[PDB]
Amino acid sequence: SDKTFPIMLEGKINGYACVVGGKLFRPMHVEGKIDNDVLAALKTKKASKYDLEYADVPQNMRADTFKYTHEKPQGYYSWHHGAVQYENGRFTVPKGVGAKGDSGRPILDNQGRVVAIVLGGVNEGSRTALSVVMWNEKGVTVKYTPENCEQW
Amino acid sequence: VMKLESDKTFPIMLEGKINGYACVVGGKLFRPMHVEGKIDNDVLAALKTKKASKYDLEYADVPQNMRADTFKYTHEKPQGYYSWHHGAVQYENGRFTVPKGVGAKGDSGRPILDNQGRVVAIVLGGVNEGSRTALSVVMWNEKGVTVKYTPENCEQW
Amino acid sequence: MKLESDKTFPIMLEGKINGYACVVGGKLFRPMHVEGKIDNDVLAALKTKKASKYDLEYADVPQNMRADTFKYTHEKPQGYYSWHHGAVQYENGRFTVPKGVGAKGDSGRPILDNQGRVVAIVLGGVNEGSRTALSVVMWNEKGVTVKYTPENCEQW
């Protein structure tokens, strides 16, 4: 794929950035440089209310980026660490899964479409509650953060 | 298609300190006229502003590329609550109040929003009245006429 | 959203606009020969003093308006200025506009420089062929009112 690029800080992967619908996304709270020259060169617009920074990607990339959708029917989804579950407008992964450095990774439905970008999470029993950003019907950004959520 | 939205309020730096805030509403840039400093945003900090001393506001048109990404505004102020950076803002009998101990110098310039996200006022100052703090602000009436309200013994922020 | 306050006001007479009044630096000005009521309650209730020699009636504008009134200036370099109907030329000490421009109902209108400052208030004019010379009150160095009226000028 390679539509997700690790953000380097000091000397490690402090997070991830990704390209969706011709837009570059990056978690605001995640400091560091993207491991890609073009992307790391783009001036971003800060959206602190959603803990996101974004920028238009050059035309010679637009079509070759993640596709997105507001369609979030309850059920199962996927992401780098395995399966994700969506129920009651909340995304969750198995307990113990998800941690620092995972901010930025997207969540995908069967069709490989990005339905959300992860910002953080927190342990709730035998499940990990996720803080994410999504998109509604009108195409507006919506953010949902679980109680006592930790930033990854 | 996507309809992203980014920050619409910016800190006004003065001598390396935050002295107020500027924001963009209805395709315009505003900043409290009594606040000294430079907008922490190159593009906006360079625009030429026109003064409106009657409202303690300085303003300028926002470029074509920024027009779609600015606060929408309204005159609609039914009684109840609204919100701003520091929390809930109550509006009753033509006056916006917040809890005592909330709001101080440095907050002038910040906007007050209704639940739909529209700006119903811009803060200019305040003064404590008992357990509440009455706010000085710029609002808009039905005709589109900019109106300013300043509480007795108000202090500029 | 309206940020700028109106600084000119139509003078009504039998339903028709007979001229204009404007507010400059804390003062209302009105062409003395123009009869009618200023179309603004506050302004119309003001008592005015007359300066016949200048064909101007004037009063102190309410303090709550002083804040957004026209700023005047004496600086009148030759070139162009503007007024409601377009460009106004200034040369050889007199303002002129094109024929077909300037008529009854235009007295009281201001002429502004590009910085939005008032350099003159029109009181009338007279066509002189391809151009129409204007009658006006201006301001000199000491901020003193001065008047200029073309030969056979008519009070619009």
Instruction: Reply yes or no on whether C74 is catalytic.
Output: no
Which residues of chain B does A135 touch, with a Cβ-Cβ cutoff of 8 Å?
Answer: 2
Are C145 and C104 members of one domain? yes
Buried b (16+ CB within 10 A) or exposed e, A44-58: bebbeebbbbbbebe
Q: Is position C2 within any domain?
A: no
Here the CATH number for the domain that contains residue B20 is: 2.40.10.10
Who among B53, B54, B144 is closest to C1 (CB)?
B144
Are A96 and A150 members of one domain? yes
CA distance B107 to B113: 15
Who among B54, B73, B143 is closest to C67 (CB)?
B54
Q: Euclidean distance between the first and final Cα of chain A, in Å? A: 23
Are C26 and C86 members of one domain? no
CA distance C56 to C34: 9
CA distance C95 to C135: 8
The answer to whether chain A touches chain B by having 3 or more C-beta pairs less than 8 angstroms apart is yes
Determine phi and psi for A41, rounding to 5 degrees.
-95, -15
C28 beta partners: C23, C59
Residue of A nearest to B5 (CA): A47
Are A87 and A124 members of one domain? yes
Tokens of B133: 């703090």
Are C116 and C139 members of one domain? yes
Tokens of B15: 């001598």
- Domain-ending residue, one of A46, A66, A86: A66
- In this structure, are residues C137 and C107 in contact, taking their beta carbons and an 8 Å threshold? no
DSSP per residue, chain A: ---EEEEEETTEEEEEEEEETTEEEEETT--SEESSTTGGGSPPEEEGGGTEEEEEPPHHHHTSSB-B-----SEEEEETTEEEEEETTEEEEETT---TT-TT-EEE-TT--EEEEEEEEEEETTEEEEEEEEE-TTS-EEEE--TT-EE-
Beta-carbon contacts of residue A79 (< 8 Å; ≥ 6 apart): A93, A105, A106, A107, A108, A118
- In this structure, are residues A142 and A132 in contact, taking their beta carbons and an 8 Å threshold? no
Are B126 and B145 members of one domain? yes
Which residues of chain B does C68 touch, with a Cβ-Cβ cutoff of 8 Å?
Answer: 52-54
Helices (H), chain C: 41-44, 63-66
Are A57 and A106 members of one domain? no
Total domains, chain C: 2
Q: Residue C47's CB: how many other CB atoms inside 10 A?
A: 7
Are B138 and B106 members of one domain? yes
CA distance A83 to A77: 6
Which residues of chain A does B4 touch, with a Cβ-Cβ cutoff of 8 Å?
Answer: 23, 45, 47, 54, 141
Are C43 and C120 members of one domain? no
Task: Specify the pairing of strand B95-99 against strand B132-140.
Answer: antiparallel
Are B27 and B64 members of one domain? yes
Tokens of B104: 């101080």
Are B58 and B103 members of one domain? no
Q: Residue B107's CB: how many other CB atoms inside 10 A?
A: 22
- By the 10 Å C-beta count (0-12 exposed, 13-18 middle, 19+ buried), C109 is classed as buried
Which residues of chain C does B145 touch, with a Cβ-Cβ cutoff of 8 Å?
Answer: 2
Residue of B nearest to C3 (CA): B146
- Among candidates B124, B104, B103, B102, which has minimal Cα distance to B35? B124
Tokens of B51: 């003064």
Q: Is position B1 within any domain?
A: no
Q: Is position C155 within any domain?
A: yes
Q: Dihedral sign, CA of A57, A59, A64, A70?
A: positive
Tokens of B88: 């809930």
Are B104 and B140 members of one domain? yes
Instruction: Provide the edge-to-edge strand list for the sheet that holds C16-24.
Output: C37-38, C8-13, C16-24, C27-31, C56-60, C49-51
CA distances from C51 to B79, C29, C56, C141, C143 (A): 52, 11, 5, 20, 16
Tokens of B139: 């609002």
d(CA B95, nearest CA chain C) in Å: 21
Residue of C nearest to B53 (CA): C67
**Resolution of this entry in Å?**
2.3
Beta-carbon contacts of residue B59 (< 8 Å; ≥ 6 apart): B28, B29, B30, B31, B49, B50, B52, C3
- Domain range holding A42? 3-66
Beta-carbon contacts of residue C45 (< 8 Å; ≥ 6 apart): none
Instruction: Reply yes or no on whether B86 is catalytic.
Output: no
Amino acid at C13: L
Instruction: Reply yes or no on whether C33 is catalytic.
Output: yes
Q: Is position C1 within any domain?
A: no
- By the 10 Å C-beta count (0-12 exposed, 13-18 middle, 19+ buried), C2 is classed as exposed
Q: Euclidean distance between the first and final Cα of chain C, in Å? A: 34
- In this structure, are residues A2 and A88 in contact, taking their beta carbons and an 8 Å threshold? no
Return the ∠ at Cα B135 (arms to B132 and B138), rounded to 5°. Answer: 160
Q: Is position B3 within any domain?
A: no
The answer to whether chain B touches chain C by having 3 or more C-beta pairs less than 8 angstroms apart is yes
- Which of B107, B108, B114, B136 is catalytic? The answer is B108
Q: Euclidean distance between the first and final Cα of chain B, in Å? A: 41
